[PDB]
Amino acid sequence: MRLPERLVEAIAESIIQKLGKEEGILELEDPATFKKKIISLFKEADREEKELEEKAKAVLRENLEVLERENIDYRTAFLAVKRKLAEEMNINVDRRERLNQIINRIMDLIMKDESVEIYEDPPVIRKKIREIVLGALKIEEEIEKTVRQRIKKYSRDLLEGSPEWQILWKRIYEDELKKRGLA
């Protein structure tokens, strides 16, 4: 479940533009700081997902001999362990359900930010943030679909998921953003 920097910034800006400037259901006394706070929420949520991965790999690393004796493939055990740790860490694995958590964290920020005022029922504000996030995710998904088509020709030369593979994915992703005018 990727949330690249450009997607996060598009969501934060769209929240400020649509709900703050256009509709006016949010009053932001410091839009620049509010945007930084939203970006920090996504960064923290990303760090949690990375921590979930390292804890899952730690379990399997410690149970190498057991997995062999059990005849359970690493990939099977990884998905199962991740499902369990995700519940214990209250991290939704589905990116859409995970975004609902992040959206609620944005609502938590909005509600506690002394530099923000709201003029509409919070659950209605959440529904509107969900619509903004879902619209941006539709764009992210059509971009990722092209990135997967373009990185296929390099799939066998790099270990999928490795740091070198992540760099190439990001490089192809940035190139798609330029071709599409999305910075």
Residue numbers in the entry: 1 to 183
Give sentences copied directly from the paper behind this entry.
AaDUF507 is a Y-shaped α-helical protein consisting of an anti-parallel 4-helix bundle base and two helical arms that extend 30-Å from the base. The tertiary structure exhibits pseudo-twofold symmetry. Structure-based query of the Protein Data Bank revealed no other protein with a similar tertiary structure, leading us to propose that AaDUF507 represents a new protein fold.
The two crystal structures differ by a 25° rigid body rotation of the C-terminal arm. The electron density map for the C2221 structure indicated an unknown ligand bound to the protein. The electron density resembled a 6-membered aromatic ring with a small, planar functional group attached. The unknown ligand site is a pocket located in the junction between the 4-helix bundle and the C-terminal arm, near the intersection of αA, αF, and αG. The ring of the ligand is buried inside the protein and the functional group protrudes out into the solvent. With the C-terminal domain rotated as in the C2221 structure, the arms of the Y are closer together and the pocket opens. Cluster 1/4 is unique to the C2221 structure; apparently, the 25° rigid body rotation of the C-terminal arm opens this site.
